[model samples]
Target: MTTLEAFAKARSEGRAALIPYLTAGFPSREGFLQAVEEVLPYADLLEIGLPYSDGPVIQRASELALRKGMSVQGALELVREVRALTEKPLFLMTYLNPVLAWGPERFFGLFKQAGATGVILPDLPPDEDPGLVRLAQEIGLETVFLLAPTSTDARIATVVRHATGFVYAVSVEVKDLVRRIKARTALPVAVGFGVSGKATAAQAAVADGVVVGSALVRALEEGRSLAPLLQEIRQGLQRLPLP
Candidate 1:
């Protein structure tokens, strides 16, 4: 399914979207795949990182992967392999450096072929350089843009206008801003930063979707089953007053 379709389905079902993030080849290459299969039932969407170290969880995930003899290309190959396991929309979250080194057009082209519906370049903004975004659109892949709490109203407008599938914001503190963004654009807005357990997830129910990164990452590190936690978060989201 398309990224937008997944969100639309969740909206129609009367629950906030649950988008989970995990680094590729993390814990173990096989373990990563197993996690994806297990989470697929609960995740409305999934963001698989390409093993770049922009955060502690990502750094450790990448390190474990490297120690296990996994390469960047290997991680991407895993993405391709996972595509056959589910019909849910899967998005790859990578920094700009990897995309550039692989060549923007080639990188996106390949991943699109690999069955990803979209990509989230946390470090790249559509306004700064529209080239990469243009490349993605041409290949029939959505370009999900990130908006920060510190972003100005004008900046948010520009991002929402160009962002294809959805706008990814950091939190619900921008609760008012998310409302403003939704009013200005047809795109769905998903808030991610600091979204921990049930309470934080409920706070983010204001948006179309909530992304949980550190919580899931910690669970993986502790070797705990994600099903119970995912179900808890899903219940929390279901408890939010309808939009």
Candidate 2:
């Protein structure tokens, strides 16, 4: 499914989309795959961190994968394998250095070929490199930009113009920030960072979706079952008051 369609489906169901992030090849190659399989039924879409960025939990996850010799190519191959498992939209989150190192055209081209629905680059603002965004879109890979509470009105406008699939809002005054972003763009806004349990997830239900990453990744690091925690977060989203 396309990322936009996944958000629409969750909207039709009257709940925020549940997006769970996993660091590719974390814990172990087989463990990562198993986690994906277990979370597929609960997730509207999946975000795979390409051995790159995030909080300490994600950093550790990425480190573990890197220690196992996970490369950009290896991550893409994992996306290919995960693609074989389900049709749910897979979003790759990577930094600019890796993309440039791999060459933007070739990087995005191969990602699309591996079945990625879109990409999220934390460091590349919409305006910094418009050509890169165009390159990805031209190859049929949607580009998702980010906004934080500190972003100015002009910044929001810039991101709205370039972002496709969805605009990822880093958790900072979610309700007001989401309102402001939605005011500027038609794309769905998904809040991430600091989302852990049912209470925090429920609080973020104002947006079109909520991304649960650190908590889930930590669970993997701790070797806990992902289902129960994922199910709890799903319940939190389901409890949102209908429009």
Candidate 3:
């Protein structure tokens, strides 16, 4: 099923599908694929990352890096390798620089073979939305976008209009932000970035699903295994008061 369809189904059931972002190739493509296989049974969706150069971004990938042997190019190959392993709907959390380096058409074609159901290009613009959005649609993939706190009312409508699956509601802003992004929007906003535990998860629940990345990824990367903490997180979510 399409990612959009999955989101719709979850929303109706009062359940938000967790989309975990895991780095590719770092933990060994086979181990990575095995992990994906393990998590797929529980996760409503999977967001496999394309190894872009890390900047100020702080996540647990390095922890996994210490345990595994692989490179960005290896990630490219792993993407294709894992496609045959799972039927769970998948999306690639990628950056613009990589897409530019790979060139649009060839880039999409490769990941399409790798089983990515959608693409999340953080730097692509509203004006340029049609370029990759149409490219994705032409090839049966969804090109998703992000929305932020500073987004004007008009911008929200415009961004979600081009959005095929769901729009990513960022926890932090690109520049400076004076306040928190509120419960706003007419579409599924998977608020993430700094999200960690139940409290923050509940905040995003104000939108749709809550996405906890670095925290959970860190749990796994440390060889600490988040199974217990994830249980608490999920149990806490299950125990939360609902209307």
Task: Tell me how far the alpha carbon of residue 50 in candidate 1 is from the true structure, in angstroms, after superposition.
Answer: 0.7
Residue-level lDDT tens digits of model 1 in 86-148: 788888888898888889888998898888888988888798888768889899888898888
Please identify model 3 stretches exceeding 4 Å from their true place: 27-31, 54-73, 173-186, 239-243
Comparing 1 and 3 by lDDT, which wins? 1
Q: lDDT per residue, candidate 2, 122-160, as tens digits?
A: 889889889889999999988999999888989999998
TM-score of each: 0.93, 0.95, 0.80
Question: Considering every candidate listed, which one attains the maximal lDDT?
Answer: 2
- Residue 105 local lDDT, model 3: 86
lDDT of 1: 0.82
- Which pairs of residues collide in model 3? none
After superposition, the stretches of candidate 2 with alpha carbons farther than 4 Å from their true spots are 239-243
Best by TM-score: 2
lDDT of 1 at 206: 71
Ranking according to TM-score, highest score first: 2, 1, 3
